Design a protein around this nucleic acid. Structure first.
Ligand SMILES: Nc1ncnc2c1ncn2[C@@H]1O[C@H](COP(=O)(O)OP(=O)(O)O)[C@@H](O)[C@H]1O
Ligand SMILES: Nc1ncnc2c1ncn2[C@@H]1O[C@H](COP(=O)(O)OP(=O)(O)O)[C@@H](O)[C@H]1O
Ligand code: ALF
Ligand code: ALF
Ligand SMILES: [Zn+2]
Ligand SMILES: [Zn+2]
Lengths: 681, 681
RNA sequence: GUCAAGCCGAGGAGA
RNA sequence: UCUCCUCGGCUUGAC
RNA sequence: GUCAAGCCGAGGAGA
RNA sequence: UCUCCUCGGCUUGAC
């Protein structure tokens, strides 16, 4: 029951007989149908050719793997061949290599394959080789870039092709190379401004993929333009003239703390540049060991983040964030009191709590809650009232807190209730930003609920920009967020409806429409570059792509050269670790060991009788000054407390250039594994 | 008249002089002969050494205990020494300790010994100590795992060995430790994917057994390969395209009930995931006290189980199951009527009975009974016709109902009758799944009847996978069931014949052959891991096994730490128990008592004048809503009615977090024993 | 020698 | 955490 | 089938 | 170099 379209056949025709190539078409153009048809044709050809037929599909998105397996690929080809989808969430209980020789067709994430190849090279496991295959298919080929995963695999492929090229003029025997097929929508521009540089970027993409030609539809293009509809663009801007009674108070607090610190930021409040200056300032303070500035630097960072979220989101979330971390610090102080006075800390607490109550009073004010938020509400109301149950609303924001607060508040707002709108916030799996993480299964359940229509409003982040193919969508909006041309075009290419609306909500002061025009111009420039390369001479095309392949290969070689070791110091115990907030000695480099080369830890009783544990098994570990050190873990049955090096400060025994690494692997010196013969009886 | 073989001597040679070790050989390799020869040699050595000779054999299977005593061990060694086999079925009338010092040789199940040791530690009974022995022999050593019974005993042994290790460098006197011998076929892989992890698993097995070396036959291996024959593999697949007239009606009923409940399973019908979602749903309903959903959740679970058995077995069994539990519920309703109306219950009854009659009409249809079943019939017919009375047929299925229905239906089918096949269903002792339990003596009688050839077809479950040594077997099949590599290899290693057939019957949609390939790969990987460990350095081997012994010891110590009490609440009467299906109060925590610390019960007349009794001495107890509460028992001469806590719902007097424990011991609070001075005159 | 009921822990498979 | 299966141990009772 | 924790690398945006 | 976001992989654990 497989189907195709005239433009699909036109674009895919060269690939039907060799011609490892790329395909670039607008979103919702049946690209996956083209891919499944091409795979079916190639496998039938191989069977008729009495040769092994092995095809892989590679995705950077697990959700895309599952969606492609469920919807478009397996149903058509379930009967003819064997099919399977792999992922981290999927338990690869069988193996990767066996499925390479069991299912005859693979759907996977790139570095499943890459890890198998690395294991093969290291010899730990049998692994796999590209020669084992006959056809590789990649989605979102634009992600093939300087050294991304797709590009890593293709660098191995290109080295093999160069070896073959050496062989052809030297020896007849050669290593077979599987065909390569790429699929994308926007090949992208690496910020190239001159259209010439955009052409060079496109040539780089082709060379990385060994692409013989872009092969975009021209003759049938017309009908495709008629088949695919483009959403109506809509720009919405609001000026932040309100927030004075609350934001001005926050700026007053920040200025008072600056006076207490006697430091000149030389930057506007609430700007991320202020936060960068802070970062530098507390790094300097900790390296110098000085206090009254690093702690205040951290607090100023927190106030800057609060100011930003207030600028985007209402005041109450910023107030809650402030009082939450202040309460955590207060509980740390209480624990420190329990085991056994401060001036800076007491100063901050006293200046804070009163203003915190005042800001609690101010926060609940619907008269001047915000401007952009009011415009967002008016918009959502208008479209959801005009749809008459035909609305699938998508909102894009920047951070976790925005999504969660907006969902909670839309559910609190009575207007969205009487319209009947149901809003659910969506985020990635990784926990961060003090927001409850959403599990992969939770992600899938929410997407399914939106698909069934139970959720008429989905708030999400760049997670939602890519993938998430939905049959019908009418409303897409971007809340004061802007990344680049790609992100914007895929966000806009989602309202798959006869009537579609694109909306942007931006602050008047911020230059977001500048980005939007720049993105428009890059989109226009890319098409001309594609036309130019499509009209190039095949010989010159081949020479340039070969030159760029050499570029990539040599770049990897010399990056490895600069990263063979690049820091070779075998010093087991030549350092002392002190606390960061306060300059108390913690330990030396001898009392520490490693487990599974995975966790660094110290088990000596000297460590044990120094820290404190905060309650809610995996209780966390804090210092005596109130600095957070680490967390309890339970491995081996041992209650070993680990720690984050970022929380501590280094001190060399030779000349002590106090410095912060933020991370273990960054440092040169190795630490031994924990032989646990000790702690016995 | 004892005999041996060259490879047997080769493998057993190290154990003949100390060297507590493991042995791993293919099934039917005379392992029991090797064990009896080794025991004879060790006992002769001890007699020549003028030292006490005590040998134990441990089995996880009572049938294996009896078989080893009857067939291979006692006949050879009846004259030279004293021999006895122990078990639960065997009445250990003498004692365990006396036989430890009476028969000089023991065959037992592991926690006979473990219970004796626990009694010794507690001081209730004299018990036994490992020092009393000189040699322990274990069969199926793979069962020694994270904290299994063999592993429990070996953890005690390893702690004793660590004490000895402390003594050697401190004090000359030491506690003697008996030699350790293990026997198995597949040491197994704990789902380890990297062959390195499989090697770690094997090292874990060795460390748990204090194994000095695997000691697998290499030089004589060749002849063994020639002596042992491997069955011819055969794969059979059928696609479930039929069942529409009946299964579609069942799905219609399920959808109608879902509409009545207004709930979205978001899962396919007939899938165990649906049943898990149900479980969660009625747990939530009962905790919330809401009806119209918990009862319907239970019914949906029953329909899901019916769908599964229909997918495997024909329709009539599912129909019978449905009408049986509906009839039981109807009789409950009639009793409830007798002592003194419902909407949900009436809805379900009315929707059911008519469709039940219709499904009775549909069930008796041989045209589209099933696919996998037809293939099974065709197979069995082919092999039993081609054997010409030389067929010993073994079938493996998943559940009780499958076994019983298949046996009854094979006897009903005229084809198996004209072939003369005799089919008997086999299950475990424990009653469950609404199938008559098969007594241990019934098990033994059936096995004997199969051995004599009176039963040419034995239908069984994982019970039959292990043990059951038969001289001649030609046909082994697996009906749409798949567990792991071990189960599969022991199922395949049973057709002990020159010509042997292995067959698998699987649904096309289900991924069972995926498991089969995975199991093949694990079997291949295990052998390479065994080779690698056999080639290891003895010192590094010793160090790693010592590390793993420490791992096990500390794991047990800290599991005990987390399980010292882990829930310490001495609250006699601080709870109220209500009914589960309906929210009627049953009793409080004061009116209940305990007998033999064994049965919780309430005897107050307030309890008595609330429940109803269903007829067929041990009549069962139901609620007034139709909920089952418990059962009559006769202890002390008292007609005390007990109950299952799983059937009731908890309600705390403090803050009432309604929750389900499913089981008494799980809860913290203790209940007093029943001092029966009351109820006197 | 046969049966019933109940309780304790363990393992494997699935999800 | 749920389901299915498997195990063996312990108590009580009856024939 | 569910959850937690930790680690490895990659990309994009900003500055 | 910093921040924000995004990704996927690996280990351990628990239910
Ligand atoms: N031959 C065809 N005729 C009509 N529609 C098609 C055909 N093939 C695919 N489609 C449509 O294309 C959609 C798939 O879009 P897809 O190509 O996955 O988006 P993207 O290009 O972003 O991957 C399906 O919903 C289907 O309706
Ligand atoms: N020395 C021997 N020579 C020939 N056959 C033997 C010898 N010892 C044992 N056997 C055979 O081995 C069988 C016992 O198999 P067994 O080892 O119990 O299976 P498993 O290895 O699964 O326990 C007996 O039927 C017997 O015929
Ligand atoms: F392949 Al697309 F949006 F073009 F997922
Ligand atoms: F000891 Al076996 F099958 F190998 F019972
Ligand atoms: Zn400190
Ligand atoms: Zn009731």
């Amino acid at each position: 029951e497989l189907q195709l379209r005239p433009y699909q056949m036109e674009v895919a025709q060269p690939a039907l007989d060799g011609k490892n190539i790329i395909i670039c078409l607008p979103t919702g153009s049946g690209k996956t149908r083209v891919a499944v048809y091409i795979t079916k044709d190639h496998l039938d050809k191989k069977k008729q050719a009495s040769e092994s037929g092995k095809v892989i599909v590679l995705v950077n998105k697990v959700m895309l793997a599952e969606q492609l397996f469920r919807k478009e690929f397996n149903p058509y080809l379930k009967k003819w061949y064997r099919i399977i989808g792999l992922s981290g969430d999927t338990q690869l209980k069988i193996s990767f290599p066996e499925v390479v020789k069991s299912y005859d067709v693979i759907i996977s994430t790139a570095q499943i394959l890459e890890n198998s190849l690395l294991n093969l090279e290291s010899g730990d496991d049998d692994g796999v080789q590209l020669s084992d295959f006959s056809l590789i298919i990649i989605d979102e080929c634009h992600h093939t870039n300087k050294e991304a995963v797709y590009n890593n695999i293709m660098r191995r492929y290109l080295k093999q092709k160069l070896r073959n090229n050496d062989l052809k003029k030297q020896n007849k025997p050669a290593i077979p190379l599987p065909q390569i097929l790429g699929l994308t929508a926007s090949p992208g521009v690496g910020a190239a401004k001159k259209q010439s540089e955009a052409e060079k970027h496109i040539l780089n993409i082709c060379a990385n993929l060994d692409a013989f030609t872009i092969k975009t539809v021209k003759e049938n293009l017309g009908q495709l333009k008629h088949q695919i509809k483009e959403p109506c663009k809509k720009f919405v801007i609001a000026d932040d003239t309100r927030e004075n009674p609350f934001k001005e108070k926050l700026l007053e607090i920040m200025a008072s703390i600056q006076t207490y610190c006697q430091k000149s930021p030389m930057s506007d409040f609430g700007t991320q540049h202020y936060e960068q200056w802070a970062i530098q300032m507390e790094k300097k303070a900790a390296k110098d060991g000085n206090r009254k500035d690093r702690v205040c630097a951290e607090h100023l960072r927190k106030y800057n983040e609060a100011l930003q979220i207030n600028d985007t989101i209402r005041m109450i979330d910023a107030y809650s964030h402030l009082e939450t971390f202040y309460t955590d610090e207060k509980e740390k102080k209480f624990a420190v009191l329990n085991d056994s006075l401060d001036e800076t800390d007491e100063f901050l607490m006293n200046l804070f709590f009163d203003n915190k109550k005042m800001l609690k009073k101010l926060a609940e004010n619907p008269k001047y809650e915000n401007e952009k938020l009011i415009k967002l509400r008016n918009t959502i109301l208008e479209q959801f009232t005009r749809s008459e149950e035909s609305s699938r609303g998508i909102i894009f924001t920047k951070t976790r807190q925005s999504t969660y607060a907006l969902s909670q508040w839309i559910m609190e707002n009575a207007k969205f209730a009487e319209v009947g709108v149901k809003a659910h916030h969506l985020i990635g799996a990784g926990h961060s930003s003090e927001v409850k993480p959403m599990t992969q299964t939770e992600q899938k359940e929410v997407i399914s609920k939106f698909r069934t229509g139970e959720i008429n409003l989905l708030i999400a982040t760049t997670v939602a920009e890519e993938g998430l193919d939905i049959k019908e969508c009418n409303i897409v909006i971007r809340y004061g967020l802007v990344t680049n041309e790609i992100a914007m075009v895929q966000a806009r290419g989602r309202a798959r409806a006869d009537e579609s609306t694109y909306v942007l909500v931006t602050s008047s002061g911020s230059g977001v429409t500048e980005r939007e025009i720049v993105n428009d111009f890059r989109e226009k420039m890319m098409y001309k570059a594609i036309n130019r390369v499509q009209n190039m001479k095949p010989e010159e095309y081949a020479h340039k792509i070969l030159e760029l392949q050499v570029q990539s290969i040599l770049e990897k070689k010399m990056k490895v050269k600069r990263s063979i070791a690049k820091q070779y110091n075998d010093n087991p115990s030549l350092i002392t670790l002190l606390c960061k907030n306060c300059s108390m000695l913690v330990c030396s480099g001898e009392n520490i060991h490693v487990v599974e080369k995975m966790h660094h830890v110290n088990m000596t009783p000297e460590f044990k009788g120094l820290y404190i544990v905060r309650e809610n098994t995996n209780g966390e570990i804090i210092c005596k000054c109130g600095q957070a050190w680490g967390t309890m873990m339970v491995h081996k049955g041992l209650d070993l407390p680990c720690l984050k090096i970022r929380n501590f400060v280094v001190n060399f025994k030779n000349n002590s250039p106090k410095k912060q690494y933020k991370k273990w692997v960054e440092l040169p010196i190795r630490f031994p594994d924990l032989d646990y013969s000790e702690y016995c009886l």
